[PDB]
Point group: none
Chain length 47, copies 3
């Protein structure tokens, strides 16, 4: 549900959606490490 933008970190995404980082991680169990994601990939955000 969010397309990663250049420079984004998980904290920035968490700030934008006002949700904890661990909730975003739990929505994406296929991700090996968020340090491998690149801009233009889309991650799921639980509402």
């Amino acid at each position: 549900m969010y397309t990663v933008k250049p420079g984004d970190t998980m904290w920035k995404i968490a700030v934008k959606y006002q949700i904890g980082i661990s909730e975003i991680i739990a929505a994406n169990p296929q991700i090996k490490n968020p340090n491998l994601i690149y801009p233009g990939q889309k991650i799921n955000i639980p509402n």
Copy 2:
């Protein structure tokens, strides 16, 4: 067939040369982490 220069990122090389970001990443599976590239590295242009 592009040599990384200081200051480059994979997104900047894709935007500057008009290559899609998923295409440049898929052309370069030898880059373990697309966020970490170094000057002098050669990357493939699809």
Copy 3:
């Protein structure tokens, strides 16, 4: 309070510590250019 590993960038260190790039930049005003950190350099992680 953290030693830069070969292969670290400020963005990778921020993502490891669950913080943002501005926060790690703010903590390190001795770093002239946040894109350029060196192996073995000591930085602050707040």
